Structure formats: structure tokens, C-alpha cells
Write a protein that binds this ligand. Structure first.
Ligand code: HEM
Ligand code: HEM
Lengths: 214, 219
């Protein structure tokens, strides 16, 4: 069974995941070292890639190689980030935004795959959403304590999946479906290789956010 | 359209242009640097090269990198492992940690070698093709400035005791990179990262500059 797309991807992106857990921006975040301005930008970055990613998934919502993975009800974060961008920046937020150069590359790549290698879109949904379902609960608590944020969710409506009531088993439904997709082994390897690229896109954002400290 | 060996130089223009001009560098070519800082730098080198060297070892048989594998002539690990002996002592391995501006550049080198090997050449050309140019001087320069053995003791990093003529070897290297067959934006990409690689060094330089000041601001 270690031949399932979800199995391949896990073993296939292990090294990249380790780099992510240990990247200085992530460790300094978890310790509560990141202040508000670097949090407002972290969110800003998050917004783009997820808005872009969701518009792109919104595009192939009925594609044979992505159809099931489509889950606007349970996953999409744009409605959440938006409310979060409203809390920190305010309704005016829109007329202020500016993405980390890396976030830009990230998005452009989310668009390329958007019409060129569509059978690899799952690599971007996987990397981002699945991670979100694994430790979002913890990140929410760290963010609230360091920035003195309300427990009622203000500013963090992003780290919470209102429509998902059980992350653990939820991701299983996702793995069961990722594997169900009609895919040849040749492409899967391209998917795994694409998930790894995706982590690096996040690695680059994490890298740019750190320097932002100075 | 053209040889990759020139697209890099022409392409990274601003990189090696915004490189000969970095406080840490100007403060180096001459002789004003504080031993304990030179030790920070050497540490950065150890972790950067250990990573870059493993990735090339991994991609040695990769058609997109094989022609640029020169372990016995270009590698610096063994050497650096020694230039860290003289400075940090013996059991320094368990004490010294990879500085942050270096850990970034590092984590990246493991990505490339593992996921985008056709770009490993960019990092190789960024450091090695660089080390070979004007290395001997650096040793001596740091020796007299830090009261170190002229011979090179403690800094065998700047000396490749396995390469005869430097200009001849590098000219050799350029011909090897050009023989590589790839796409077009592939060269553009390779160059993009050589610049990306430079910045990585930049972050590492002043990261030391400010670190050396935090060593001066105290007195
Ligand atoms: C300190 C930081 C992080 C920690 C401690 C962490 C921890 C974990 C843990 C324990 C799991 C395993 C859950 C399971 O398999 O059921 C997981 C899964 C996941 N994480 Fe992370 N993670 C971190 C950062 C990230 C980042 C930065 C990304 C990518 C941007 C990421 C992407 C994922 C993905 C895709 C999964 C699902 C793997 C799978 O089940 O196939 N994680 N993470
Ligand atoms: C310490 C200050 C520096 C000085 C004075 C300096 C000087 C030079 C000189 C004169 C050359 C010879 C040109 C040739 O190869 O024909 C050269 C080449 C080179 N240097 Fe620098 N350099 C410096 C810093 C750097 C830095 C920070 C890097 C970046 C890692 C670097 C990377 C290179 C590379 C890649 C080459 C090969 C160029 C070629 O293709 O010919 N150098 N450098």
C-alpha cells in the first residue's frame, strides 16, 4: 500500500518537511518571537497564494485529475484570511497590500500549473491544506498569546476550519481520495516532485520573512 | 544563443558588482578583521561547503552535473574541518552551530541537489569558480592580520593542494559547463540562482559585519 499517492508524497517530501520545521522563521514563530508587523505580512503572503490557489482550484473544480480534491466548503481559506486582513489592517487593508517577492513566484507557479500541468495541482493543495490541518490549532494559540489576540478568533479566523470538525480523520478522507484519482505512476512521481517544489516556495517565503526582521 | 559560461558572468553582473563592495570584504582584502569573527566566517564556510559537496556527491552520475564533479581538486570540507581545528580547537564540532545566514543558504543547497539538480551548477560556479580566483592572497592576508602561520596553518581553505594552474583549471571548467545540454530559460534560470546564490553570501557577509561590530561596540 506504500504505492499510494499519499504514501509516495509523504516519503517523497520528508526531507523538505524537515527543512520547514527547522527553518528559523518557523522556530522563532512557534516561540512567539514574531511581532505584529511580521504577522501582518505573513498573513498577506498567505492570502495571495491561497486566493490564487483557490481561484485555480476553482478553475479545475471539475477536472478528472482534481475533481474530488475540490472542497470549497471544508477547506478554502480566502473567506478566512479576508476577515483576518480586516482585523489587522482594517477595511482599508486592500489599498495597502504587498506580497513578498517569493510569494509572487509562488503564485505565478500556482497559475502556470493552472493550465499547463493540471494533473499536478493536487501537489499544491496537498502541501498547503494538509499542513494546515496538522498543526493549525497550535499556531492559532501561539499567535493569540504573542500578539495578545482574542480567544474568540479575531485575527486568526484563518487557523480555524469552521466546517471541519475532525482534522485527523478528515485528512484520511483526503488521502483516500488522492489515491482514488486515475493516475499513472509516471505522473505521480511528477506530483511528488511538485509537492517538494511547493515546500521550497514556502521555504522562500519563510526565508524572506526572516530577513524582514533585521 | 550563447555559452553558459558567459551568461553567468554577464547575467550575475550586479551580483559580483554588488559583491566587491561589501563592508566585510573591503575590511578583509586589507587586514582589519577580528580573529573570533574570521572564525564565524570559517564556520559559515564549513556548513555551506559540506552541504554543497554532499549534493554534488549525490548528483555525481547525473548527466546534468557529472562533468562538474571534481572532489580531489575543488572540495574544501576536509580542509575547512581543519581550519576550524586551529581556531575553535578540537571538540568544536559539538559546540559550533551553523550561523543563520548560512543555514538558509545551506537548507537551499540540499533542496536543489535533491529536487532541481540542473541548477546545482549555479551554486558550484558561485563558490568554487570563485575560490580559485585570488585565493592564495586571502590566506597570507589573513595570516599577517591575525598573527597566523604564513605557511597557511589553520587556513588550508584558500589552498588547493591538488590543482596545478588555476586559470587553466577554471578555463577547463567553463568548457565543461558549456558542453551541458539543457533548455534556454534553463540557462536563464541557472543564472537567476547564481544571483540568488550571491545574495545568500551577501546576507552572510554583513551578518558577520554586524556580528564583528557587536564585538567592537563592546570595549
Ligand atoms: C514546526 C513546523 C511544523 C511541524 C512541527 C509540523 C508537523 C507536522 C506533523 C506532526 C505532521 C504529521 C501529521 C500526519 O501525518 O497525520 C505534519 C503533516 C504535514 N505537514 Fe507539517 N509541520 C510543520 C510545518 C509544515 C510546513 C511549513 C509545511 C509546508 C508548508 C507542512 C506541510 C505538511 C503536510 C503537507 C503534511 C501532511 C503530510 C501527509 O500526511 O501526507 N508542515 N506536519
Ligand atoms: C573578496 C572580494 C572579491 C574580489 C576582490 C574578487 C575578485 C575576482 C577576480 C579578479 C576574479 C577573476 C575574474 C576571472 O575569473 O577571469 C573573480 C572571479 C570570480 N569571483 Fe570574485 N571576487 C571577490 C568576491 C567574490 C564573491 C563574494 C563571490 C561570490 C561567491 C565571487 C565569485 C567569483 C566567481 C564565480 C568568479 C569566476 C568568474 C569567471 O567566470 O571568470 N567573488 N573574482
Amino acid at each position: 500500500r506504500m504505492a499510494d499517492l499519499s504514501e509516495l508524497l509523504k516519503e517523497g517530501t520528508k526531507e523538505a518537511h524537515d527543512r520547514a520545521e527547522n527553518t528559523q522563521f518557523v522556530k522563532d514563530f512557534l516561540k512567539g518571537n514574531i511581532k505584529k508587523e511580521l504577522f501582518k505580512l505573513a498573513t498577506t503572503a498567505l492570502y495571495f497564494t491561497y486566493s490564487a490557489l483557490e481561484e485555480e482550484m476553482e478553475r479545475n473544480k471539475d477536472h478528472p485529475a482534481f475533481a474530488p480534491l475540490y472542497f470549497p466548503m471544508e477547506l478554502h481559506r480566502k473567506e478566512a484570511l479576508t476577515k483576518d486582513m480586516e482585523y489587522f489592517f482594517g477595511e482599508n487593508w486592500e489599498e495597502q497590500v504587498q506580497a513578498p517577492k517569493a510569494a509572487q513566484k509562488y503564485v505565478e507557479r500556482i497559475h502556470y500549473i493552472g493550465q499547463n500541468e493540471p494533473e499536478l495541482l493536487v501537489a499544491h493543495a496537498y502541501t498547503r491544506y494538509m499542513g494546515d490541518l496538522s498543526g493549525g490549532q497550535v499556531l492559532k494559540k501561539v499567535a493569540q498569546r504573542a500578539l495578545k489576540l482574542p480567544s474568540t478568533g479575531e485575527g486568526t479566523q484563518f487557523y480555524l476550519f469552521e466546517n471541519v470538525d475532525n482534522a485527523q480523520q478528515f485528512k484520511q478522507l483526503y488521502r483516500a481520495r488522492m489515491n482514488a484519482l486515475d493516475l499513472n505512476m509516471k505522473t505521480k512521481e511528477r506530483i511528488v516532485e511538485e509537492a517538494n517544489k511547493a515546500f521550497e516556495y514556502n521555504m522562500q517565503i519563510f526565508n524572506e520573512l526572516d530577513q524582514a526582521g533585521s
